[PDB]
Amino acid sequence: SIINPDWNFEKMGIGGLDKEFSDIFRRAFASRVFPPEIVEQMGCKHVKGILLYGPPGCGKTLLARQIGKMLNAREPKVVNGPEILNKYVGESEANIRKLFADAEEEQRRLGANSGLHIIIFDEIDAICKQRGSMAGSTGVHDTVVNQLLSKIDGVEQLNNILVIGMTNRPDLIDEALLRPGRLEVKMEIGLPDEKGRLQILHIHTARMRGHQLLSADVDIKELAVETKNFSGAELEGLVRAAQSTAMNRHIKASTKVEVDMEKAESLQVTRGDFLASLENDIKPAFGTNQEDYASYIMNGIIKWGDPVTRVLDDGELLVQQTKNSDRTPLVSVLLEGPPHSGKTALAAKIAEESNFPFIKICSPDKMIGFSETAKCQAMKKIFDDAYKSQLSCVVVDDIERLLDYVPIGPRFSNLVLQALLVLLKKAPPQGRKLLIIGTTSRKDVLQEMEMLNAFSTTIHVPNIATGEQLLEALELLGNFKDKERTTIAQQVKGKKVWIGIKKLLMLIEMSLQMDPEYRVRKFLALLREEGASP
Amino acid sequence: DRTPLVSVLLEGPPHSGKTALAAKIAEESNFPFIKICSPDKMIGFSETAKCQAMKKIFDDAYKSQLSCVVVDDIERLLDYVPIGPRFSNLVLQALLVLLKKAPPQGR
Ligand SMILES: Nc1ncnc2c1ncn2[C@@H]1O[C@H](COP(=O)(O)OP(=O)(O)OP(=O)(O)O)[C@@H](O)[C@H]1O
Ligand SMILES: Nc1ncnc2c1ncn2[C@@H]1O[C@H](COP(=O)(O)OP(=O)(O)OP(=O)(O)O)[C@@H](O)[C@H]1O
Ligand SMILES: Nc1ncnc2c1ncn2[C@@H]1O[C@H](COP(=O)(O)OP(=O)(O)O)[C@@H](O)[C@H]1O
């Protein structure tokens, strides 16, 4: 026995996680804490390894170092997954073998009283003959896994080893590395919560409080509630950025204003720095991105007709439905409308007003030149990442352009079709909601391919069809004069009006490119030219 | 004793609850070996991988004295789509050959 029965995990680095320690100890290392005498009387072996999986950058290695330290073991021998890889035949195996030289020597010499060695892999998935299943060529010369297995156990027995692995894609691990007698204990490290964020922020700001250099104005609870779905490293980055900005401001002010030395020595970080850097410096991967909205909602939304209100209200009802309910952890909805009816903007809007923590937009714009397998990889990655939050809402910007449709033929990529059809019907991990929004301009084709059946609801987005609607929209935009408006109203009473908002904006901009004399006539001529009759 | 291999097919209109009935009838058998092979676990695979997975499941199932193997949503496995038509031939042939193979004597 080298530790107290109740352990201790506080103000020694790791602060977020406290229950996982107790759980893992109760499950795994009960053998090494009990009076030895009965242990030798027991004839029972010790667990020969464990595996940890969780979202990247959530503080896993710290657990390994702490557990290695507390047990009174030797120095951990860190190693990197991809690093152990060579193109020369029969070379990586030597690397895998060398790691156990010290343990072998100690076991041979001291017999059954040697110390404890610990070996810490990193991205253990690097060496597996399972990644080759997916579309590609990464057979990684399976021999590696056989060598690793035959070294952990086999004809020669080692009783002085403990293997700890860290990975991010739990699925891609070969099954054989989980049978009893080998790595045989799993655990999950989920995202931190409010209390964990508070503890981590408090820990990393101890120096400033000790030296009083921090401004008294700043709190920690406010900032903690501000950060919704950050990760471990993000809090440290935020603190560093705040320090840098505060000091830059202080030095610039001192140079600009010859302040008395009293404030010059003072380097108070103040509170403005924290918020400024938070909104301008750090961009969490798992959090909301306020930036992307502007890239699609470029001109806001102006209420020009009743349908907008109906659509927004229905979106609100769907959001309410997905938030609080059971028996339906997954929901779907599809938007359809003629070309240039501004479907995308509505989707982005409704997603924004959803007010969910995790929101992401995946459009074909960031995938040009990709072969289909890459598209499957992207879809899978984004959905898998979205599965790691309590709530989530994803937006598939343009379903049609994803499939590579073209009326001639017809032609498309079947593989993407399957991937989407299967994915739209997979419940998240237990106790987690979701919301998926589509978009398209070709309803009939989707109806024909049986995919419309998978979606669970539909909404319609019509166009401008009435003259008075056009007058009201023009007035809202505010680009035409009173007598000019009268002329337009006089000439547009025919009611044969059917146009899309995007086209209307472009047409107005074009018509505003000559002298005031001829604007009305040119605009009317161009509008008359586009006499659509759906 | 003289019919070691049996088969059965469920079918109905969509949303009629077939998967649930299949799973329930499988559970109520009290056989020692059960295994469900669904399309949800092979997203984005290549057909060769699907064939290998099918072969592995059936090989493992052979070893025991009893068993009950369930294949769910045949059409999705084949990757059917009414336009065309288009689908995978390899999966179809593998499944069809498998579905009439006897295990080793007395199983
Ligand atoms: N109330 C509104 N309704 C629709 N669009 C609006 C509205 N107000 C402004 N817009 C502008 O309409 C455009 C909408 O872009 P969007 O991509 O949705 O159009 P689209 O051509 O119909 O779609 P897509 O090409 O993606 O199929 C943006 O410029 C947006 O600024
Ligand atoms: N008698 C019943 N038959 C079928 N499902 C039932 C029955 N009673 C309740 N259910 C519920 O129905 C749901 C089963 O629906 P399920 O998704 O299996 O339908 P399906 O038509 O077989 O699916 P799919 O065609 O999408 O593969 C479960 O919630 C189950 O609890
Ligand atoms: N629970 C935690 N408490 C304190 N710091 C943490 C915690 N989790 C992550 N960190 C921060 O993350 C950094 C190390 O991250 P690391 O352990 O390498 O992530 P991973 O284990 O996922 O690779 C440290 O600088 C540390 O400040």
Curated annotation (Swiss-Prot), chain B:
ATP binds at P14, H15, S16, G17, K18, T19, A20, L21. It comes from the Eukaryota. Phosphorylation at Ser-38 interferes with homohexamerization. Mg(2+) binds at T19. Homohexamer. Interacts with GABARAP and GABARAPL2. Interacts with GRIA2. Interacts with PLK2, leading to disrupt the interaction with GRIA2. Interacts with MUSK; may regulate MUSK endocytosis and activity. Interacts with CDK16. Required for vesicle-mediated transport. Catalyzes the fusion of transport vesicles within the Golgi cisternae. Is also required for transport from the endoplasmic reticulum to the Golgi stack. Seems to function as a fusion protein required for the delivery of cargo proteins to all compartments of the Golgi stack independent of vesicle origin. Interaction with AMPAR subunit GRIA2 leads to influence GRIA2 membrane cycling. Belongs to the AAA ATPase family. This is Vesicle-fusing ATPase. The lineage of its organism: Eukaryota, Metazoa, Chordata, Craniata, Vertebrata. The gene is NSF. The chain holds residues 532 to 638 of 744 of the full protein.
